[PDB]
Amino acid sequence: MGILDEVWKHKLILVETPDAQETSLALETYRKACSNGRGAILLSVARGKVSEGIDFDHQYGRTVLMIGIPFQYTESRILKARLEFMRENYRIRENDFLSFDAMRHAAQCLGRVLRGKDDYGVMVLADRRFSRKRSQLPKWIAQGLSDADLNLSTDMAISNTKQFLRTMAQPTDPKDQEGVSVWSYEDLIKHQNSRK
Amino acid sequence: EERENEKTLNDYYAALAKKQA
Amino acid sequence: DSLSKEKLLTNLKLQQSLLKGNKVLMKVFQETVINAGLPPSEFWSTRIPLLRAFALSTSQKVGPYNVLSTIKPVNKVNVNLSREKILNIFENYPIVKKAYTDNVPKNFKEPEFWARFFSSKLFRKLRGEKIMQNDRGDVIIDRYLTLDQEFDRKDDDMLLHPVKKIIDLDGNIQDDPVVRGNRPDFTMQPGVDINGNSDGTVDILKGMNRLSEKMIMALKNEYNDERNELKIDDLNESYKTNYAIIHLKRNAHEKTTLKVSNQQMLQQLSLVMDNLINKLDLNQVVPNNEVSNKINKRVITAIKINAKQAKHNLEVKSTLP
Amino acid sequence: ASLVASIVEARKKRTAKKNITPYQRGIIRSLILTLDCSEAMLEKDLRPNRHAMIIQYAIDFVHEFFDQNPISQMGIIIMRNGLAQLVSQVSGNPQDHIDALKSIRKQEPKGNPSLQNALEMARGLLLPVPAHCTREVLIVFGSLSTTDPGDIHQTIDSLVSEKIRVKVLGLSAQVAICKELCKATNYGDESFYKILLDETHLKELFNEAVTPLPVNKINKGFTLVKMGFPTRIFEDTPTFCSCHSKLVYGGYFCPNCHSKVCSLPTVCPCCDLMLILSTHLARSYHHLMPLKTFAEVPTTEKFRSEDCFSCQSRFPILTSSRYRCEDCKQEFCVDCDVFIHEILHNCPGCESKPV
Amino acid sequence: MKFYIDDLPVLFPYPKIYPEQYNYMCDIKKTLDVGGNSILEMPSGTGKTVSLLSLTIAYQMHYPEHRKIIYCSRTMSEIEKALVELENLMDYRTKELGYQEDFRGLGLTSRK
Amino acid sequence: ESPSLLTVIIEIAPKLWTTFDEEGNEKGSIIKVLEALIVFLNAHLAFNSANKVAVIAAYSQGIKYLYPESTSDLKIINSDMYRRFRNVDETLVEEIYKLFELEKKQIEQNSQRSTLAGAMSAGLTYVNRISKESSLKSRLLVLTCGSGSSKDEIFQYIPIMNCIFSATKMKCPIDVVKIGGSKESTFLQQTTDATNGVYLHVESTEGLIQYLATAMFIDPSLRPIIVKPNHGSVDFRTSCYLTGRVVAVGFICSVCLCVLSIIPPGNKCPACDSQFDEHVIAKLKRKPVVPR
Ligand SMILES: [Zn+2]
Ligand SMILES: [Zn+2]
Ligand SMILES: [Zn+2]
Ligand SMILES: [Zn+2]
Ligand SMILES: [Zn+2]
């Protein structure tokens, strides 16, 4: 189509490959491009090696684009046998387990964006089936998902992202987080005494 | 005419190259 | 490097380059260095920034970037090339340079080479495009396909190196070497065809992967750690400024190259009060006609001097030829 | 509560202005203005476009910079086609820089930016700068990416070695390299990377940079600079100037070589001696003895006079519309407080009070 | 810092602390004292490894039982991160307690 | 063309005018100045019906706004005159009567520093208030008596030099009229020259109206077309910090910007307690190089 050509003008493209050692080199190059300001985009699988222990925080993670729900290959004998076994024994619906399996992988990748409370990033879940899965996401991710973001378009999401990135780049007021989100020794003691 | 200004500079620089060399 | 006082004062080729173009500087050099006899070294002593600025203009280069991706062919198709782009192609793709240097002066001219190169399969292989057997390619360039494959192997070794255990994915799969489970479905494995051979899509994925690695490695040219990265910075003590303060004590000596008492002050203060309370005549303010002429003469004396100076307070017109 | 909301907002604004300590500031400066002229500057987020607005504010910044820092120097660089282009050499003439900016206003921005190329050029322009001047770079970045030919980290280390200081004004969002460049160069401080949120904030950001940057305690460069105070002369016939070799009716006379100059403050073109007037130095006295902030007087206590001490304005009769100075203890109106700390730099009550 | 739980002195390796970490540590200690299994879900934006190591190491070093700890990750990279966090915690403990207490901590992986 | 505000700053003090009377042969000359000022203010109100008047007096213990009177009636002047002129002249004299009586009460009070800088600063504040409130020009007039030997004018440098810049920002020319023995005031002269103002020095109090109406009557609306009658030429130089002599070429500390004609004793700045590097100061101490 000619879409990757437009991507090259803004960020370098690093792709995940079946070879593990090559992917490690891609991560090394991906990290270097992020730090030096050149910018890089990492294409990886939701159920692969990069999503099971590699974290993208601070510059490394500024936007995560989940391309569809990481559903399993339904037409697999192993999966169907497990679903039947679970339903007969543990009374687990086949559709419910598939959604549970799919969302837990999607949430896994979303949680690798933030390390501290001073970090920020935009999480976009690009799929129509994600609209009704808000309740299945982790609690701390659902509480930040506004009711108006359950079904957005590319233009609307881009507009929100530009406003959000602009806002998060401003100096935070220390008084706003002095003792409500970060605690010192004096604050911790106050909380203990008040509770006691 | 600028040509003589560059030529005399070129001759001087050529002389400079000839003198230094 | 060639950006210091010593080398710039010795770079005679550069000294001639800017003087050739600059006109006002050239005029001064001709009058002061040719006929007057001022040494060339002293003339450039006070103009170091001029020399450095001229050198930096042509001493800087653009950064690496994918050149063949930006090239769009746009039956006849006209593709516009540039000298800068041609050099970029050579830098980013050493195989293209190899085929260029050994054929341009020997077999055919440069324009023929680039026309053949774009129509060849190498231009499609170097680009992240899947090679199609239906395409005919070009006879000359197709020979280098094997050489490019060998170069790719060399590039892979030039990039291979041990990676930090933090992001070492190789060890994760080797954590338990005896994991014998269910083989992953075909969705989790590279695509294959009916015959079972590769489809060729992984090759282009590696091609763009290799290009990015080469570009970053080019940046880091000739021109413990995990401890800091794994720490939470937000929980650390906030940065404290170490600025200095100055207490400026201001006391300076007075500039250098009849006092009344309180009783006298009171008497004068009473006199002014007595004069004000009694009566105030604004008509007496008019002069007596003997000081008014003097006052006007004194003021006009300063006006004439100021008018003379203010009349002559792009170069002004000159009477000389 | 609407009126109360404004007052508390003013109090919050005054909170940042309450802590005014006599920090040591470098009055003699050497600034390099790096503007971005790339494809990313063709957007319409700032009407009419980023390139036009930035240049317009740059001209205003140039005017303000030299008005409040008359004995400082400035240079201008532009990032075009991945290369750094020099448009004005380090000089004390405010007109040369304005002329260069106006010419740039015509050419359309294109290409990619390169911080390394601009920073490397800045490192060179600031190399022939005395040790008593503060070498500073004010980068106006507009792109979210940087294409460089070498390692930007090496340049950042080089800048720290040369005691150069960098201020970056981004447009869209934070960039990791810019944050490191400003942090590793400002002794760890992270307040030197500013991202505007609208046009009004942009004007404030340029205006803020006009003030001198406070120096660090461990960075000592104290020295005595040989200066000169020339005497203006009024000649009947035009004479050749020693700086531009043209015919000018007037001009100052250097006290070291008697060679004349056209405008001040400039270094003598013969003895390389800085020429300045007493007024040029007086312009910066308020940066060494800042006026202590005025504290709102609570309504519980009694007041001295019903009208302002300086402007004789009837104080509007909840909150006391009076501001007092601790040094002299004289009430002031809200209007005077703004004019006494921004335009004026001396408290009229303190001067009027005898000692 | 060095703050107190009902009877357990715990040394955090940072001067600050999040509210979640204190709740996380309190819940973990309750689970250990009462005995049994528990499931905890803390946001990734809050220091997680520090909270577990700080409290668990203190529990082992304070109570007479001196129970050992088994930290199971899913990959070799995560083991390195846990060990790096553990090293920082122990270094802070040595600096604050004035002596290097008898402590042995090792990871485990394949020969390769 | 447009209305212009006039703000007169008169420096009245027992120590200043008493010396002026004793030095000369004119007793009560302050009355002559006051009458001339009253006429001058009336003339300004006659140039247009939309221009206001402001008078600020700098007395021994502070400043006072003679006009306009603070919101908080002996017949000094005849009532036959114009209502508007009387409404201003009468108030001015009444405040003058009150202030001098107050000054007489505190005659024994010790006042060592003049209050001219404060009055000028207050006048500038009034100019801003008028400009912002209600398209009005402004003009400051400093009618000071320099006959009295001043104690030390150094403390008047930093404030006065700060008024110059402020006056140049609001386009407010400041004119200065000096009545005293000293011919030149290096601080006041610079103020007028750098602010498009007029400086005039007069020794005799009599005939002051002629000087005021012919020299300091130029309104801000026609400054560009009238050449100022100023005669003295200023140098814009400042005296040293530890010698008190004007310096044409010298040294200034890069931290505090204090002028120094010679190298300070002890190789340390006397204004900010900053230690200069021995090597760098030794560079200045080097003498010219001539072949042996
Ligand atoms: Zn000139
Ligand atoms: Zn000179
Ligand atoms: Zn006021
Ligand atoms: Zn005060
Ligand atoms: Zn000093």
PDB file of N, CA and C in Angstrom, chain D residues 24 27 222-231 255 278-279 282-283 285 288-289 307 310-314 335 339 343-346 351-355, chain F residues 61-63 65 68-71 113 115 121-122 125-126 128-129 132 158-159 165-166 190 236-237 247-252 254-257 276 280 284:
ATOM      1  N   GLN D  24      22.702  35.291  42.674  1.00  0.00           N
ATOM      2  CA  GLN D  24      23.746  35.817  41.802  1.00  0.00           C
ATOM      3  C   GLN D  24      23.397  35.487  40.356  1.00  0.00           C
ATOM      4  N   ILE D  27      24.907  39.031  34.532  1.00  0.00           N
ATOM      5  CA  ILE D  27      24.370  40.121  33.726  1.00  0.00           C
ATOM      6  C   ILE D  27      24.962  40.094  32.323  1.00  0.00           C
ATOM      7  N   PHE D 222      34.557  34.668  38.617  1.00  0.00           N
ATOM      8  CA  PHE D 222      34.684  36.066  39.001  1.00  0.00           C
ATOM      9  C   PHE D 222      35.948  36.672  38.405  1.00  0.00           C
ATOM     10  N   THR D 223      35.843  37.922  37.967  1.00  0.00           N
ATOM     11  CA  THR D 223      36.970  38.626  37.367  1.00  0.00           C
ATOM     12  C   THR D 223      36.587  40.087  37.186  1.00  0.00           C
ATOM     13  N   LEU D 224      37.570  40.882  36.773  1.00  0.00           N
ATOM     14  CA  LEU D 224      37.385  42.291  36.462  1.00  0.00           C
ATOM     15  C   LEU D 224      37.556  42.490  34.963  1.00  0.00           C
ATOM     16  N   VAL D 225      36.594  43.168  34.343  1.00  0.00           N
ATOM     17  CA  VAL D 225      36.585  43.396  32.902  1.00  0.00           C
ATOM     18  C   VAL D 225      36.920  44.858  32.647  1.00  0.00           C
ATOM     19  N   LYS D 226      37.862  45.097  31.737  1.00  0.00           N
ATOM     20  CA  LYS D 226      38.282  46.452  31.397  1.00  0.00           C
ATOM     21  C   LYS D 226      37.221  47.086  30.507  1.00  0.00           C
ATOM     22  N   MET D 227      36.545  48.105  31.029  1.00  0.00           N
ATOM     23  CA  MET D 227      35.482  48.801  30.321  1.00  0.00           C
ATOM     24  C   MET D 227      35.867  50.259  30.104  1.00  0.00           C
ATOM     25  N   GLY D 228      35.090  50.930  29.259  1.00  0.00           N
ATOM     26  CA  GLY D 228      35.332  52.325  28.955  1.00  0.00           C
ATOM     27  C   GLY D 228      34.054  53.122  28.802  1.00  0.00           C
ATOM     28  N   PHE D 229      34.079  54.379  29.242  1.00  0.00           N
ATOM     29  CA  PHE D 229      32.925  55.267  29.150  1.00  0.00           C
ATOM     30  C   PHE D 229      33.262  56.418  28.212  1.00  0.00           C
ATOM     31  N   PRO D 230      32.859  56.365  26.947  1.00  0.00           N
ATOM     32  CA  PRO D 230      33.218  57.429  26.006  1.00  0.00           C
ATOM     33  C   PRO D 230      32.362  58.673  26.210  1.00  0.00           C
ATOM     34  N   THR D 231      32.808  59.763  25.591  1.00  0.00           N
ATOM     35  CA  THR D 231      32.121  61.046  25.646  1.00  0.00           C
ATOM     36  C   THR D 231      31.600  61.392  24.259  1.00  0.00           C
ATOM     37  N   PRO D 255      37.919  56.281  24.834  1.00  0.00           N
ATOM     38  CA  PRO D 255      38.913  56.915  25.708  1.00  0.00           C
ATOM     39  C   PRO D 255      40.278  56.247  25.691  1.00  0.00           C
ATOM     40  N   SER D 278      26.949  54.849  31.422  1.00  0.00           N
ATOM     41  CA  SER D 278      26.495  54.586  32.783  1.00  0.00           C
ATOM     42  C   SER D 278      25.068  54.057  32.800  1.00  0.00           C
ATOM     43  N   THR D 279      24.231  54.503  31.860  1.00  0.00           N
ATOM     44  CA  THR D 279      22.857  54.019  31.803  1.00  0.00           C
ATOM     45  C   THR D 279      22.801  52.524  31.512  1.00  0.00           C
ATOM     46  N   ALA D 282      23.208  50.773  34.695  1.00  0.00           N
ATOM     47  CA  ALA D 282      22.113  51.032  35.622  1.00  0.00           C
ATOM     48  C   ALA D 282      20.885  50.196  35.292  1.00  0.00           C
ATOM     49  N   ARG D 283      20.736  49.781  34.033  1.00  0.00           N
ATOM     50  CA  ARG D 283      19.571  48.998  33.639  1.00  0.00           C
ATOM     51  C   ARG D 283      19.505  47.658  34.356  1.00  0.00           C
ATOM     52  N   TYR D 285      20.738  47.037  37.602  1.00  0.00           N
ATOM     53  CA  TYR D 285      20.862  47.097  39.055  1.00  0.00           C
ATOM     54  C   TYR D 285      19.718  46.368  39.746  1.00  0.00           C
ATOM     55  N   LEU D 288      20.291  42.762  40.858  1.00  0.00           N
ATOM     56  CA  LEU D 288      21.198  42.485  41.964  1.00  0.00           C
ATOM     57  C   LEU D 288      20.622  42.847  43.321  1.00  0.00           C
ATOM     58  N   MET D 289      19.679  43.786  43.374  1.00  0.00           N
ATOM     59  CA  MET D 289      19.000  44.176  44.608  1.00  0.00           C
ATOM     60  C   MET D 289      17.492  44.157  44.377  1.00  0.00           C
ATOM     61  N   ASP D 307      -6.158  56.602  51.285  1.00  0.00           N
ATOM     62  CA  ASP D 307      -5.722  56.685  49.899  1.00  0.00           C
ATOM     63  C   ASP D 307      -4.311  56.130  49.756  1.00  0.00           C
ATOM     64  N   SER D 310       1.423  56.475  47.077  1.00  0.00           N
ATOM     65  CA  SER D 310       2.151  56.896  45.886  1.00  0.00           C
ATOM     66  C   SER D 310       1.262  57.546  44.834  1.00  0.00           C
ATOM     67  N   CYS D 311       0.090  56.974  44.557  1.00  0.00           N
ATOM     68  CA  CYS D 311      -0.787  57.477  43.510  1.00  0.00           C
ATOM     69  C   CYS D 311      -2.009  58.215  44.038  1.00  0.00           C
ATOM     70  N   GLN D 312      -2.214  58.257  45.351  1.00  0.00           N
ATOM     71  CA  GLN D 312      -3.345  58.960  45.950  1.00  0.00           C
ATOM     72  C   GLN D 312      -4.664  58.477  45.344  1.00  0.00           C
ATOM     73  N   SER D 313      -4.902  57.175  45.479  1.00  0.00           N
ATOM     74  CA  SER D 313      -6.120  56.539  44.992  1.00  0.00           C
ATOM     75  C   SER D 313      -6.909  56.026  46.186  1.00  0.00           C
ATOM     76  N   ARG D 314      -8.181  56.410  46.262  1.00  0.00           N
ATOM     77  CA  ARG D 314      -9.042  55.959  47.346  1.00  0.00           C
ATOM     78  C   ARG D 314      -9.138  54.442  47.348  1.00  0.00           C
ATOM     79  N   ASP D 335      -2.969  48.664  42.015  1.00  0.00           N
ATOM     80  CA  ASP D 335      -2.382  49.112  40.756  1.00  0.00           C
ATOM     81  C   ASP D 335      -0.909  49.465  40.926  1.00  0.00           C
ATOM     82  N   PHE D 339       2.989  48.133  39.131  1.00  0.00           N
ATOM     83  CA  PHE D 339       3.899  49.054  38.465  1.00  0.00           C
ATOM     84  C   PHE D 339       5.203  49.250  39.227  1.00  0.00           C
ATOM     85  N   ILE D 343       7.766  47.842  36.258  1.00  0.00           N
ATOM     86  CA  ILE D 343       8.338  48.969  35.528  1.00  0.00           C
ATOM     87  C   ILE D 343       9.376  49.646  36.411  1.00  0.00           C
ATOM     88  N   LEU D 344       8.941  50.153  37.561  1.00  0.00           N
ATOM     89  CA  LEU D 344       9.864  50.713  38.532  1.00  0.00           C
ATOM     90  C   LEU D 344      10.566  49.592  39.295  1.00  0.00           C
ATOM     91  N   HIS D 345      11.660  49.953  39.968  1.00  0.00           N
ATOM     92  CA  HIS D 345      12.413  48.994  40.764  1.00  0.00           C
ATOM     93  C   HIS D 345      12.862  49.604  42.087  1.00  0.00           C
ATOM     94  N   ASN D 346      12.135  50.606  42.574  1.00  0.00           N
ATOM     95  CA  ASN D 346      12.422  51.230  43.859  1.00  0.00           C
ATOM     96  C   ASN D 346      11.106  51.555  44.547  1.00  0.00           C
ATOM     97  N   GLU D 351      12.402  55.317  49.669  1.00  0.00           N
ATOM     98  CA  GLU D 351      13.166  56.502  49.297  1.00  0.00           C
ATOM     99  C   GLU D 351      12.699  57.732  50.064  1.00  0.00           C
ATOM    100  N   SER D 352      11.385  57.893  50.232  1.00  0.00           N
ATOM    101  CA  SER D 352      10.859  59.046  50.950  1.00  0.00           C
ATOM    102  C   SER D 352      11.191  58.997  52.436  1.00  0.00           C
ATOM    103  N   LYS D 353      11.313  57.806  53.006  1.00  0.00           N
ATOM    104  CA  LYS D 353      11.591  57.693  54.432  1.00  0.00           C
ATOM    105  C   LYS D 353      13.025  58.131  54.716  1.00  0.00           C
ATOM    106  N   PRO D 354      13.241  59.111  55.590  1.00  0.00           N
ATOM    107  CA  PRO D 354      14.611  59.510  55.920  1.00  0.00           C
ATOM    108  C   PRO D 354      15.280  58.518  56.859  1.00  0.00           C
ATOM    109  N   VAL D 355      16.609  58.541  56.845  1.00  0.00           N
ATOM    110  CA  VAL D 355      17.400  57.658  57.692  1.00  0.00           C
ATOM    111  C   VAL D 355      18.479  58.462  58.407  1.00  0.00           C
TER     112      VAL D 355
ATOM    113  N   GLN F  61      10.618  65.460  55.912  1.00  0.00           N
ATOM    114  CA  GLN F  61      10.334  64.154  56.493  1.00  0.00           C
ATOM    115  C   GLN F  61       9.491  63.265  55.585  1.00  0.00           C
ATOM    116  N   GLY F  62       9.377  63.590  54.305  1.00  0.00           N
ATOM    117  CA  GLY F  62       8.643  62.727  53.393  1.00  0.00           C
ATOM    118  C   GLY F  62       8.138  63.509  52.190  1.00  0.00           C
ATOM    119  N   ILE F  63       7.014  63.039  51.649  1.00  0.00           N
ATOM    120  CA  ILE F  63       6.374  63.648  50.494  1.00  0.00           C
ATOM    121  C   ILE F  63       4.901  63.863  50.809  1.00  0.00           C
ATOM    122  N   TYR F  65       1.105  65.075  48.618  1.00  0.00           N
ATOM    123  CA  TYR F  65       0.425  65.427  47.375  1.00  0.00           C
ATOM    124  C   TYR F  65      -0.349  66.720  47.593  1.00  0.00           C
ATOM    125  N   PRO F  68      -3.727  66.599  43.343  1.00  0.00           N
ATOM    126  CA  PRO F  68      -5.061  66.852  43.897  1.00  0.00           C
ATOM    127  C   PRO F  68      -5.133  66.587  45.398  1.00  0.00           C
ATOM    128  N   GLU F  69      -5.961  67.355  46.100  1.00  0.00           N
ATOM    129  CA  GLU F  69      -6.064  67.210  47.545  1.00  0.00           C
ATOM    130  C   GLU F  69      -6.607  65.835  47.908  1.00  0.00           C
ATOM    131  N   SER F  70      -6.084  65.273  48.994  1.00  0.00           N
ATOM    132  CA  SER F  70      -6.576  63.991  49.477  1.00  0.00           C
ATOM    133  C   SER F  70      -8.035  64.112  49.892  1.00  0.00           C
ATOM    134  N   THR F  71      -8.803  63.050  49.643  1.00  0.00           N
ATOM    135  CA  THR F  71     -10.223  63.070  49.981  1.00  0.00           C
ATOM    136  C   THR F  71     -10.433  63.352  51.464  1.00  0.00           C
ATOM    137  N   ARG F 113      18.778  62.910  54.907  1.00  0.00           N
ATOM    138  CA  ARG F 113      18.689  62.511  53.510  1.00  0.00           C
ATOM    139  C   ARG F 113      17.515  63.211  52.838  1.00  0.00           C
ATOM    140  N   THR F 115      14.521  63.857  50.015  1.00  0.00           N
ATOM    141  CA  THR F 115      13.416  63.015  49.564  1.00  0.00           C
ATOM    142  C   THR F 115      12.998  63.397  48.152  1.00  0.00           C
ATOM    143  N   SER F 121       9.634  59.156  42.111  1.00  0.00           N
ATOM    144  CA  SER F 121       9.021  57.839  41.972  1.00  0.00           C
ATOM    145  C   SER F 121       7.512  57.915  42.163  1.00  0.00           C
ATOM    146  N   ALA F 122       7.057  58.693  43.148  1.00  0.00           N
ATOM    147  CA  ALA F 122       5.622  58.853  43.355  1.00  0.00           C
ATOM    148  C   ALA F 122       4.965  59.514  42.150  1.00  0.00           C
ATOM    149  N   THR F 125       4.315  57.054  39.432  1.00  0.00           N
ATOM    150  CA  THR F 125       3.162  56.219  39.747  1.00  0.00           C
ATOM    151  C   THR F 125       1.861  56.948  39.441  1.00  0.00           C
ATOM    152  N   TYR F 126       1.793  58.241  39.768  1.00  0.00           N
ATOM    153  CA  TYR F 126       0.599  59.019  39.455  1.00  0.00           C
ATOM    154  C   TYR F 126       0.375  59.095  37.951  1.00  0.00           C
ATOM    155  N   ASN F 128       1.142  56.865  35.701  1.00  0.00           N
ATOM    156  CA  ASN F 128       0.576  55.594  35.264  1.00  0.00           C
ATOM    157  C   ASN F 128      -0.904  55.505  35.611  1.00  0.00           C
ATOM    158  N   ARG F 129      -1.273  55.948  36.813  1.00  0.00           N
ATOM    159  CA  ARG F 129      -2.671  55.882  37.229  1.00  0.00           C
ATOM    160  C   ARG F 129      -3.556  56.697  36.295  1.00  0.00           C
ATOM    161  N   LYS F 132      -3.691  54.930  32.742  1.00  0.00           N
ATOM    162  CA  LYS F 132      -4.529  53.738  32.704  1.00  0.00           C
ATOM    163  C   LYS F 132      -5.995  54.070  32.948  1.00  0.00           C
ATOM    164  N   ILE F 158      21.093  55.189  42.522  1.00  0.00           N
ATOM    165  CA  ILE F 158      20.331  53.998  42.146  1.00  0.00           C
ATOM    166  C   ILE F 158      18.857  54.319  41.939  1.00  0.00           C
ATOM    167  N   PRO F 159      18.183  55.058  42.826  1.00  0.00           N
ATOM    168  CA  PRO F 159      16.767  55.372  42.566  1.00  0.00           C
ATOM    169  C   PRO F 159      16.560  56.224  41.324  1.00  0.00           C
ATOM    170  N   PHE F 165      14.696  54.903  33.212  1.00  0.00           N
ATOM    171  CA  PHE F 165      14.195  53.825  32.366  1.00  0.00           C
ATOM    172  C   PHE F 165      12.673  53.779  32.378  1.00  0.00           C
ATOM    173  N   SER F 166      12.070  53.931  33.559  1.00  0.00           N
ATOM    174  CA  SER F 166      10.614  53.937  33.647  1.00  0.00           C
ATOM    175  C   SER F 166      10.029  55.111  32.875  1.00  0.00           C
ATOM    176  N   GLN F 190      21.720  64.038  33.700  1.00  0.00           N
ATOM    177  CA  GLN F 190      21.569  62.794  32.953  1.00  0.00           C
ATOM    178  C   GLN F 190      20.101  62.411  32.819  1.00  0.00           C
ATOM    179  N   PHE F 236      27.474  61.020  30.730  1.00  0.00           N
ATOM    180  CA  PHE F 236      26.941  59.701  31.067  1.00  0.00           C
ATOM    181  C   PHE F 236      28.017  58.821  31.700  1.00  0.00           C
ATOM    182  N   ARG F 237      28.799  59.406  32.600  1.00  0.00           N
ATOM    183  CA  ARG F 237      29.839  58.698  33.329  1.00  0.00           C
ATOM    184  C   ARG F 237      29.460  58.589  34.799  1.00  0.00           C
ATOM    185  N   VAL F 247      35.610  58.141  36.029  1.00  0.00           N
ATOM    186  CA  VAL F 247      36.495  57.205  35.347  1.00  0.00           C
ATOM    187  C   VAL F 247      36.064  57.105  33.891  1.00  0.00           C
ATOM    188  N   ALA F 248      37.015  57.310  32.981  1.00  0.00           N
ATOM    189  CA  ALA F 248      36.766  57.110  31.560  1.00  0.00           C
ATOM    190  C   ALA F 248      37.047  55.679  31.126  1.00  0.00           C
ATOM    191  N   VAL F 249      38.118  55.080  31.638  1.00  0.00           N
ATOM    192  CA  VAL F 249      38.434  53.677  31.393  1.00  0.00           C
ATOM    193  C   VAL F 249      38.844  53.055  32.720  1.00  0.00           C
ATOM    194  N   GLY F 250      38.232  51.933  33.060  1.00  0.00           N
ATOM    195  CA  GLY F 250      38.510  51.291  34.321  1.00  0.00           C
ATOM    196  C   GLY F 250      38.085  49.843  34.323  1.00  0.00           C
ATOM    197  N   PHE F 251      37.861  49.322  35.526  1.00  0.00           N
ATOM    198  CA  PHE F 251      37.480  47.933  35.735  1.00  0.00           C
ATOM    199  C   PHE F 251      36.155  47.875  36.481  1.00  0.00           C
ATOM    200  N   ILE F 252      35.324  46.898  36.128  1.00  0.00           N
ATOM    201  CA  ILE F 252      34.043  46.676  36.786  1.00  0.00           C
ATOM    202  C   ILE F 252      33.922  45.197  37.125  1.00  0.00           C
ATOM    203  N   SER F 254      32.391  41.662  37.453  1.00  0.00           N
ATOM    204  CA  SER F 254      31.399  40.974  36.636  1.00  0.00           C
ATOM    205  C   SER F 254      30.211  40.489  37.454  1.00  0.00           C
ATOM    206  N   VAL F 255      30.324  40.472  38.782  1.00  0.00           N
ATOM    207  CA  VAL F 255      29.234  39.973  39.615  1.00  0.00           C
ATOM    208  C   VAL F 255      28.284  41.101  39.994  1.00  0.00           C
ATOM    209  N   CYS F 256      28.822  42.197  40.537  1.00  0.00           N
ATOM    210  CA  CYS F 256      28.008  43.309  41.006  1.00  0.00           C
ATOM    211  C   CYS F 256      28.026  44.519  40.086  1.00  0.00           C
ATOM    212  N   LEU F 257      28.909  44.550  39.089  1.00  0.00           N
ATOM    213  CA  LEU F 257      28.988  45.666  38.148  1.00  0.00           C
ATOM    214  C   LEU F 257      29.250  46.982  38.878  1.00  0.00           C
ATOM    215  N   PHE F 276      38.701  37.747  43.418  1.00  0.00           N
ATOM    216  CA  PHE F 276      39.140  37.656  42.033  1.00  0.00           C
ATOM    217  C   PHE F 276      40.336  36.721  41.923  1.00  0.00           C
ATOM    218  N   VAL F 280      44.012  35.999  36.721  1.00  0.00           N
ATOM    219  CA  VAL F 280      43.251  36.846  35.810  1.00  0.00           C
ATOM    220  C   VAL F 280      43.503  38.320  36.098  1.00  0.00           C
ATOM    221  N   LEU F 284      45.466  41.922  33.850  1.00  0.00           N
ATOM    222  CA  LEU F 284      45.229  43.356  33.736  1.00  0.00           C
ATOM    223  C   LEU F 284      46.453  44.152  34.170  1.00  0.00           C
TER     224      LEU F 284
END
